């Protein structure tokens, strides 16, 4: 039947439109089960039926696009090419017969997507009929057909695989003429949206931006026209242009900047439009600030634009009671100001805003004084280096606004003070502790105005948070006595009515003071502990949920500061509070508030208790695992489906290309990260104590190495890998291999794919640390082959990026601030080279000589770092990599000496102390582990090392570690290869270079050799008649510089046995001691008592 299934289709379509959920959750299910192969000629006919309801045709056309955007490989293939080429030409007819521009836009969204899936097969599009449709429609003198063609080209820009060779210059013709179509303004607006979509699609193509530069003047005119007609469709296009491809705007940047300034400045347009115009400029200050820095004339005019939006405040009747949680011009301008001060810098921005803030602070408008203090708070981050100098003047002036006749201004002043305490730390704390603490305490007390009193407490938390413990301790008795007073009075008020806004902040403020005060808080423990314990038993209501969590945080931070001993007095009564509040927080299953407060409070109890925490592990691990495993809700919607989910606010969407989009529920993403970081804490603190949880935590963490939604989670997952192996170690190597098996492949894939550099460096360090955990036999041949390719690629990229950054310099818009970014990029690339050297070090240390054939693939790249014209960090790290080959892969290391030995010998004399140290080290391990093949080179190296050691300034803070390493290398030459040196002659000089105390490893080595020399059958080192024995007392006296580790090392006992044996020779002992300074004399006593 053909006529029977068409009449019943209209009622089913309207059924899934009724306002009640009864038939709504019954008519949608019947629709989906229908075969998709038949849904084509059934649903397109409901749009063609123009005599049917206009709201049913809106739904039929929206439903037809979704079946093409989501499903395609099951519906279109294997269907007859009679009905294949019939849905192509019938869809084209609907657009020609459409009178309503609403439906014309819905059916054009179906013309594209169909065009998109056919074209996206191989490259060449299987629908040349869709292409002819646009050239003939844009050329047809019909406005509707012209508009339909521009909509298909906006939706799917680039319906061609061979556009470049010929159809490219005709696209310019089409849009240039459409932007000149004065007779109609919507056709001009549609081609501006198309021009932008086309330029965005053709990203990276710098030859195409240069060719289409001629479209930017007409494009800017199209935003200037559309905006005054309530259309922020073309303005969004420009913001997208400035964000993704700002260099396209370079030819007419002044015109772009002037227009964006005009739209924003024009009071007449709506808030959404003016804010978007500001956003063009703000985005350019992040994306292309080097270009924007040249148009100072425009950035100067933008400053009062943001300031005028910041003074667009509503006089909220009953502000002092309610809670303010942000779309307004006052928030938009303020945020834009922060972002632009950060983007362009304080050198250019502070001079432009300085006099404007003084005109707003010194004004009777209140809205102006409030805007002034919020502008001061905003510019702080980006201009703080330039704001110091006037800082004492700024602070003393801002402190007067706390006594302002307007409570909202007293609140913005609180914000200014609190934000400066963060932006200018710790200089702020050292300079204004007396004035700021005193003024904030007074605002927290003599206000009788909840919001201002709460904000002053919040500013005080910011102040104490970044305050050095050093200068907080004198203010303890005063601040503590004042905080206790406010806590006890605001606790009575919680009981009278239910006011808690200030009390929440007082509690957190106490916690901040306690945490910073550490051990110095114990004399004030009894003054708050029973008051806070009383609060967590009181605050059980859903209104007080935050007040209870903040009190638990305060309680756990107080016990953590005083330490396990002082806390043991009220520990039992307080651990039961947490046990009871865990079942109270869990019996009302939710997410977001008390979760992170509880997780962190239990973890603080584990640091306090240590090995006694074990009993609480099943009660804390269960809930911790649940929030650490939250799978966030991800959606793959299309078109403008970010309007119905805008009310959520936390549901963030990243608009992907080709109309599709990606959405993610940000709820609990920070809770997941907190929990993952907590699991890392439990693993580290407990070690052996965590074995029961190691397998399930390992199973949880491995997939989180690929959790690209939150960097903090990935870092926690990466950090936990060696720590979990460290825990599991207690069960033996068979369980260790079972754990390492889950990790290995995933850790290696992560290194090869990781986007972020700092997250990559944790994964790379983590992988190296796991290799150390049980090296040799810990790697598959597939893994070695994969790792080889990954490290070789990472090395290839290191040098490639060196050339790229050079090409970034030698660009029209190159300045000192772009050089600062290139140097940051270089610093990151170097830190990745250190982690390449780290992964390499652990493979060498564990596999030894065996792995040199594998390493030959990286050999040309490692040699490439040790080249003479490379930057010093390359030569430093390449030498470090060869030092691990000499130390861990000798004597086979010598086959490869033609790659490192001669440059390493030469480099001992390098201008860079980091290079000198790496070279000196290699020569020391050459004598110790190298073997007989290096013997001639040990005889040769000696005067090179002694020339560095003996030169002046060898012991500068800059060159100590290099000189010490040279001293220790000379030492290793003496001890391990004494046929290559006349040890009997260099020993007096060697002795004079002692002691070592900066390089702790080399201090151990040198001292261990000195002990062999003193303990030897015929010392030589003592001097005839023990003449230089008192000098050995001065060397051993350091000592003072923590060189020889008092208990830990065997040489510590050895050195004290060599010294205490002297005590039995009266005159010799007193001679050696009488010529030691009283500081040195105590260092000998200190050693003798502990070794």
């Amino acid at each position: 039947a053909a006529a029977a299934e068409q009449q019943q289709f209209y009622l089913l379509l309207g059924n899934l439109l009724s306002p009640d959920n009864v038939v709504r959750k019954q008519a949608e299910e019947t629709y989906e089960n229908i075969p998709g192969q038949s849904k084509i000629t059934f649903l397109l006919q409901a749009i063609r039926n123009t005599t049917a309801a206009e709201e049913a045709r809106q739904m039929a056309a929206v439903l037809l696009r979704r079946l093409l955007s989501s499903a395609f490989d099951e519906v279109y293939p294997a269907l007859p090419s009679d009905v294949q080429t019939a849905i192509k030409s019938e869809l084209l007819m609907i657009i020609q017969m459409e009178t309503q521009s609403s439906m014309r836009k819905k059916v054009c969204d179906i013309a594209a997507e169909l065009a998109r899936n056919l074209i996206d097969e191989d490259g060449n599009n299987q629908w040349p009929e869709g292409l002819k449709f646009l050239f003939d429609s844009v050329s047809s003198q019909n406005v509707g057909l012209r508009e339909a063609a521009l909509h298909i080209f906006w939706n799917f820009p680039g319906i061609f695989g061979n556009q470049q060779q010929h159809y490219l210059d005709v696209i310019k013709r089409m849009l240039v003429q459409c932007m000149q179509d004065q007779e109609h303004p919507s056709i001009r607006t549609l081609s501006a949206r198309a021009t932008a979509a086309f330029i965005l699609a053709n990203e990276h193509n710098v030859a195409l931006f240069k060719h289409f530069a001629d479209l930017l003047p007409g494009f800017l005119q199209a935003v200037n026209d559309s905006c005054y007609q309530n259309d922020d469709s073309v303005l969004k296009s420009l913001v997208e242009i400035a964000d993704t491809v700002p260099k396209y705007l370079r030819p007419h940047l002044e015109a772009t900047l002037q227009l964006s300034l005009k739209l924003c400045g024009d009071t007449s347009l709506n808030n959404m439009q003016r804010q978007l115009a500001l956003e063009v400029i703000v985005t350019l200050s992040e994306t292309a600030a080097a270009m924007l820095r040249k148009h100072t004339n425009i950035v100067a005019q933008t400053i009062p634009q943001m300031l005028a939006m910041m003074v667009d405040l509503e006089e909220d009747e009953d502000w002092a009671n309610a809670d303010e949680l942000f779309d307004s011009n006052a928030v938009a301008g303020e945020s834009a100001l922060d972002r632009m001060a950060c983007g362009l810098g304080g050198k250019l921005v502070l001079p432009m805003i300085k006099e404007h803030i003084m005109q707003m602070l010194q004004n009777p408008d209140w809205k102006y004084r409030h805007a002034g203090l919020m502008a001061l708070s905003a510019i702080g981050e980006g201009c703080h280096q330039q704001m110091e100098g006037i800082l004492n003047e700024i602070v003393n002036f801002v402190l007067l606004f706390l006594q302002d006749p307007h409570p909202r201004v007293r609140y913005a002043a609180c914000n200014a003070v609190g934000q400066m305490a963060t932006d200018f730390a710790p200089g702020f704390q050292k300079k204004f502790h007396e004035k700021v603490i005193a003024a904030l305490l007074q605002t927290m007390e003599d206000q009788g105005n909840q919001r201002v009193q709460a904000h002053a407490a919040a500013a005080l938390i910011n102040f104490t948070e970044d305050c050095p413990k050093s200068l907080l301790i004198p203010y303890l008795d005063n601040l503590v006595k004042h905080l206790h007073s406010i806590m006890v009075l605001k606790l009575q008020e919680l009981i009278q009515k239910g006011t808690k806004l200030v009390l929440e902040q007082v509690v957190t403020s106490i916690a901040s003071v306690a945490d910073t005060a550490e051990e110095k808080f114990v004399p004030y423990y009894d003054l708050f502990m029973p008051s806070l314990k009383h609060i967590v038993e009181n605050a059980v209501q859903k209104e007080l949920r935050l007040l209870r969590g903040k009190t638990i945080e305060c309680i756990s931070l107080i016990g953590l500061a005083v330490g396990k001993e002082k806390f043991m007095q009220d520990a039992s009564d307080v651990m039961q509070l947490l046990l009871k509040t865990q079942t109270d927080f869990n019996d009302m299953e939710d997410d977001d508030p008390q979760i992170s407060y509880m997780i962190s409070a239990w973890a603080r109890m584990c640091k306090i208790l240590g090995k006694e925490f074990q009993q609480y592990l099943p009660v804390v691990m269960g809930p911790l695992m649940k929030t650490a495993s939250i799978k966030p809700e991800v959606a793959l919607l299309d078109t403008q489906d970010m309007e119905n989910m805008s009310d959520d606010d936390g549901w963030e969407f990243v608009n992907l290309g080709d109309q599709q989009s990606f959405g993610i529920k940000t709820a609990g993403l920070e809770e997941k990260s907190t929990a993952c970081q907590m699991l890392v804490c439990y693993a580290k603190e407990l070690k052996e104590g965590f074995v029961e949880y190691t397998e399930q935590v390992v199973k949880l963490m491995v997939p989180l190495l690929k959790f690209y939604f939150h960097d903090g989670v990935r870092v926690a997952a990466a950090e936990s890998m060696p720590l979990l192996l460290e825990c599991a170690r207690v069960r033996g190597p068979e369980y260790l291999t079972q754990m390492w098996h889950f990790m290995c492949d995933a850790l290696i894939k992560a290194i090869g794919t990781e986007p972020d550099s700092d997250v990559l460096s944790e994964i790379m360090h983590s992988f190296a640390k796991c290799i150390e955990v049980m090296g040799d036999g810990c790697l598959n041949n597939e893994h070695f082959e994969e790792l080889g390719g990954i490290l070789k690629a990472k090395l290839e990229e290191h040098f490639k990026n060196q050339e790229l950054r050079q090409v970034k310099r030698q660009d029209e818009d190159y300045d000192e601030q772009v050089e600062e970014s290139l140097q940051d990029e270089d610093d990151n690339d170097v830190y990745i080279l250190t982690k390449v050297s780290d992964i390499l070090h652990s493979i060498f240390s564990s596999y030894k000589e065996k792995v040199l054939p594998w390493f030959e693939q990286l050999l040309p790249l490692i040699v490439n770092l040790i080249c003479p014209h490379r930057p010093w960090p390359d030569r430093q790290w390449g030498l470090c990599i060869f030092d691990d080959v000499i130390e861990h892969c000798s004597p086979a290391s010598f086959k490869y000496a033609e790659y490192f030995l001669r440059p390493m010998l030469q480099y001992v004399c390098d201008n860079s102390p980091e290079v000198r140290q790496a070279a000196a080290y290699g020569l020391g391990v050459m004598a110790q582990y190298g073997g007989d093949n290096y013997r001639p080179f040990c005889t040769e190296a000696l005067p090179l090392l002694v020339r560095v050691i003996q030169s002046a300034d060898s012991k500068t803070k800059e060159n100590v570690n290099a000189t010490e390493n040279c001293i220790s290398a000379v030492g290793k030459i003496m001890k391990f290869k004494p046929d290559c040196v006349n040890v009997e002659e260099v020993l007096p000089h060697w002795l004079s270079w002692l002691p070592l105390h900066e390089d702790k490893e080399e201090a151990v080595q040198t001292f261990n050799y000195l002990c062999d020399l003193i303990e030897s059958n015929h010392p030589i080192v003592l001097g005839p008649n023990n003449t230089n024995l008192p000098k050995i007392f001065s060397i051993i006296a350091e000592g003072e510089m923590h060189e020889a580790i008092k208990h830990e090392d065997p040489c510590a006992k050895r050195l004290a046995n060599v010294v205490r044996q002297v005590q039995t020779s009266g005159g010799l002992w007193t001679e050696c001691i009488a010529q030691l300074s009283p500081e040195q004399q105590a260092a000998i006593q200190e050693l003798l008592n502990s070794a």
Binding site: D883, Q917, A918
Partner: peptide
């Protein structure tokens, strides 16, 4: 961190 320091190094060589």
């Amino acid at each position: 961190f320091r190094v060589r």
